[PDB]
Design a protein around this ligand. Sequence first.
Ligand SMILES: NC(=[NH2+])c1ccc2[nH]c(-c3cc([C@@H](CC(=O)[O-])C(=O)[O-])cc(Br)c3[O-])nc2c1
Ligand SMILES: [Ca+2]
Ligand SMILES: [Cl-]
Length: 223
Amino acid sequence: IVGGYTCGANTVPYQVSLNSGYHFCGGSLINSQWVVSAAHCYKSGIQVRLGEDNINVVEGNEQFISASKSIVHPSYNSNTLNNDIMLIKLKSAASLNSRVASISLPTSCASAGTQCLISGWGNTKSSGTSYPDVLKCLKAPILSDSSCKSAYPGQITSNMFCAGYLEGGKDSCQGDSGGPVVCSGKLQGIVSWGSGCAQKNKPGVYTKVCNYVSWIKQTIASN
Ligand SMILES: NC(=[NH2+])c1ccc2[nH]c(-c3cc([C@@H](CC(=O)[O-])C(=O)[O-])cc(Br)c3[O-])nc2c1
Ligand SMILES: [Ca+2]
Ligand SMILES: [Cl-]
């Protein structure tokens, strides 16, 4: 997260870290046995780490659970990142409490101007790499579809939306991919891509979760 602030320990109880001997992507807990992340974060040997704040220190509240299976959307296109979503089923259910909790799926899509909270342990530098130990937060608004298409002509599908600041300075970045974009307590987006991080007129692009609720429910119901 570039230009964000320190969230504060366990203030984002649905945030998870996907770990393969190091933190490589974020995710969101949607029930005690399932996490939603981005399809381009897929790999084998994933360990999901819940109740984390400092990912390099075991401070208490952490729950490390192996993924039993990862389900990448069948229509995911790694060249356009269209349908950049994946579901991960945990080997055992997590114990939910105040520090580890699920986030709700939306019933409707959000409008432009809606303010959202984006969080993650991704890079905090737009020009260089600096990875934090604790979780960073950023409040960002969803931009209009016209501004988003204007910024990324020919690259925005109906399953994506832009959120951020055209002036640059504040944005999500590599390492934050797969993590949550929550607006009014509902998971509206998944960190997916952008051109660099926090560059002027190049806001972040997110997977539009409201377009996948039925797919998510049907897939969880059958697995
Ligand atoms: N500006 C954003 N809102 C944003 C969000 C998620 C991103 N994820 C990435 C991302 C970048 C890389 C680098 C590779 C590198 O420098 O090592 C690349 O350009 O391919 C790789 C991954 Br995988 C990303 O998710 N960039 C991102 C940018
Ligand atoms: Ca820790
Ligand atoms: Cl266009």
